[PDB]
């Protein structure tokens, strides 16, 4: 355990910062999906009526 | 100072309203009805317009030919139009031909034959009208605009109605429509020009006394519309001119913001490259459009109905690579009604409107149309002094507050017809309804 710490002494801080990043990035991912769907809905929902000239 | 509008009622509840002008020799009498296409359902949509055709196709007394002759002998003409909320039937004549014209109008409204043979004949005429409106681009654009803004609601329907209904309208449903809707409490007999009020009231007592009254008489101009932000694109690369309308939900006749919406409309105003003065107009949008050749014309509008309205602009342009600029600059001018307008623009628009509302009424038909419209939408003719006071009450704060709740960051209904490849998608248009810098 001691030698593992000696090789990677940032370990504890790194994993806590990673938890914060995971949470923020996941929330941003969810919101980015909502926003993409919101902005795209006029294109997705578009309908056509064709009357051949 | 114009002569006072006299107003009387009959017992059935028919209003008679008149404004005499001893300087003219012609008179416009007619019947304004608070009823139109919006009173139809989806099955009989088209009926009101169908009736307008049959009203001139012969009555229980005079046949079609006799009717033609009787009007020819009067000397003037008869005219009619059906809209979404209003139907009008009027007769322009000579001063002393007014009793004849009232008698003919009373006849075609109360005692029309609606003969199966005539229904069947007009059924083709109206079918041909469906394929020839196609040319009147402004009308095509505004009918699509109503259809989309009021999607699947009565105000969204056309006046002509679908082809299917035209083939299935019977004399029964025609009769039912005019019996339910053409009632005395919904009708106004109007006279303008060389008419005596007391003479017109007597003629009303003679011809329109046996009109049905409705069971539940509501006041004149009594109506729920749910506006849909949406777009119709009718791209046609072979047309040289693009026609574009953009509108938001506007104001009804009796809104508290009715004058504020008119002032806001006058701040943008109209433009037409063919008129010589238009390059010198004060409107900011006018200056942008003329300097950069963005459009052949634009016309701001503020259309009102009993319970809603549409406020917006209609643009025409041959500049097909700069449609984006045209739309961009127009909506940035609307943004400024929310962010920037001050006493400078507001007082200039008020000045222009104080005259404009009076100037419009320059002949007997315009006067009759004004009395009839106001009586069937407001229940009264509003005097120019009251109108001058309501306009004077509009401040820059009122305009800003109105634009912030009506225009700013709001959904639009948008219709484009013609070479509109350069018109961007809905989001990019609707994003110009606000300014990130504010
Ligand atoms: C270069 C590499 C870019 C990749 C960035 C991903 C995470 C890096 C952030 C560092 C970090 O550990 O931040 C954590 C939070 O992560 C986060 O919340 C950051 C994730 C956010 C994703 C990206 C959003 C914008 C980032 C890029 C913009 C840079 C320039 C723009 C001005 C916790 O650290 P802490 O919360 O203790 O930090 C002190 C302030 N309390």
Automatic annotation (TrEMBL), chain A:
Location in or out of the cell: Mitochondrion inner membrane
Family the UniProt entry places it in: Belongs to the cytochrome c family.
Protein name: quinol--cytochrome-c reductase
Record organism: Yarrowia lipolytica (strain CLIB 122 / E 150)
Range within the parent protein: 276 to 328 of 330
From TrEMBL, chain B:
Cofactors demanded by this protein: Zn(2+)
Name of the top EC class for this enzyme: hydrolase
GO biological process, one term: protein processing involved in protein targeting to mitochondrion
InterPro entries the UniProt entry points to: Metalloenz_LuxS/M16 (IPR011249), MPP/UQCRC_Complex (IPR050361), Pept_M16_N (IPR011765), Peptidase_M16_C (IPR007863)
Function summary: Catalytic subunit of the essential mitochondrial processing protease (MPP), which cleaves the mitochondrial sequence off newly imported precursors proteins. Preferentially, cleaves after an arginine at position P2.
Name under which the protein is recorded: mitochondrial processing peptidase
EC numbers on record: 3.4.24.64
GO cellular component: mitochondrial processing peptidase complex; mitochondrion
Catalysed reactions, semicolon-separated: Release of N-terminal transit peptides from precursor proteins imported into the mitochondrion, typically with Arg in position P2
Domain Peptidase M16 N-terminal: 16-163
Superkingdom of the organism of origin: Eukaryota
Entry keywords, A to Z: Hydrolase, Metal-binding, Metalloprotease, Mitochondrion, Protease, Transit peptide, Zinc
Domain annotation Peptidase M16 C-terminal: ranges: 169-353
Family, as annotated: Belongs to the peptidase M16 family.
Cell location: Mitochondrion
Coiled-coil ranges from the UniProt annotation: none
Main location: mitochondrion
UniProt GO molecular function: metal ion binding; metalloendopeptidase activity
A Pfam family reported for this protein in Swiss-Prot or TrEMBL: Peptidase_M16_C
């Amino acid at each position: 355990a001691f030698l593992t710490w000696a090789a990677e002494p940032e370990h504890d801080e790194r994993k806590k910062l990673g938890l914060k990043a995971i949470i923020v990035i996941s929330a941003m991912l969810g919101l980015s999906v909502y926003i993409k769907k919101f902005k795209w809905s006029p294109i997705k929902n578009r309908k056509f009526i064709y009357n051949p000239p | 100072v114009s002569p006072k509008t006299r107003t009387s009622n009959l017992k059935n509840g028919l209003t008679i309203a008149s404004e005499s002008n001893p300087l003219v020799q012609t008179a416009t009498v007619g019947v304004w009805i608070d009823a139109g296409s919006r009173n139809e359902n989806a099955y009989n949509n088209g009926t009101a317009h169908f009736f307008e055709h049959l009203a001139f196709k012969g009555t229980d007394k005079r046949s079609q030919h006799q009717l033609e002759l009787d009007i020819e002998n009067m000397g003037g003409h008869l005219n009619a139009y059906t809209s979404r909320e209003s139907t009008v039937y009027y007769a322009k004549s000579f001063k002393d031909d007014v009793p004849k014209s009232v008698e003919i109008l009373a006849d075609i409204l109360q005692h029309s034959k609606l003969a199966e043979s005539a229904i069947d004949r007009e059924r083709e005429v109206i079918t041909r009208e469906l394929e020839e409106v196609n040319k009147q681009y402004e009308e095509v654009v505004f009918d699509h605009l109503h259809a989309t803004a009021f999607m699947n609601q009565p105000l969204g329907r056309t006046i002509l109605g679908p082809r299917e209904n035209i083939q299935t309208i019977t004399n029964t449903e025609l009769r039912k429509f005019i019996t339910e809707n053409y009632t005395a409490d919904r009708m106004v007999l109007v006279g303008a020009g060389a008419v005596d009020h007391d003479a017109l009231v007597e003629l009303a007592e003679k011809y329109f006394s046996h009109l049905p009254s409705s069971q539940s008489p509501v006041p004149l101009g009594t109506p729920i519309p749910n506006f849909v932000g949406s777009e119709v694109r009718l791209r046609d690369d072979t047309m040289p001119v693009a026609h574009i309308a953009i509108a938001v939900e506007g104001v009804s006749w009796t809104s508290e913001d009715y004058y504020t919406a008119l002032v806001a409309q006058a701040i943008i105003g109209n433009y037409d490259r063919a008129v010589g003065t238009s390059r010198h107009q004060g409107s900011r949008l006018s200056n942008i459009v003329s300097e950069n050749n963005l459009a052949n014309s634009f016309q701001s509008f503020s259309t009102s109905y009993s319970d809603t309205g549409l406020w917006g602009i209609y643009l025409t342009s041959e500049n097909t690579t700069q449609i984006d600029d045209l739309v961009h600059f127009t909506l940035k001018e609307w943004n400024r009604l929310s962010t920037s307008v001050s006493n400078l623009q507001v007082e200039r628009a008020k000045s222009q409107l104080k005259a404009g509302l009076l100037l419009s009424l320059d002949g007997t038909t315009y006067v009759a149309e004004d009395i009839g419209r106001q009586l069937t939408t407001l229940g009264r003719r509003v005097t120019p002094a009251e109108v001058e006071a309501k306009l004077e009450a509009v401040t820059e704060h009122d305009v800003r507050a109105w634009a912030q709740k009506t225009l700013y960051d709001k959904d639009i209904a948008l219709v484009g017809l013609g070479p509109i490849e350069g018109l961007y998608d809905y989001n990019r248009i609707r994003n110009d309804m606000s300014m990130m810098r504010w």
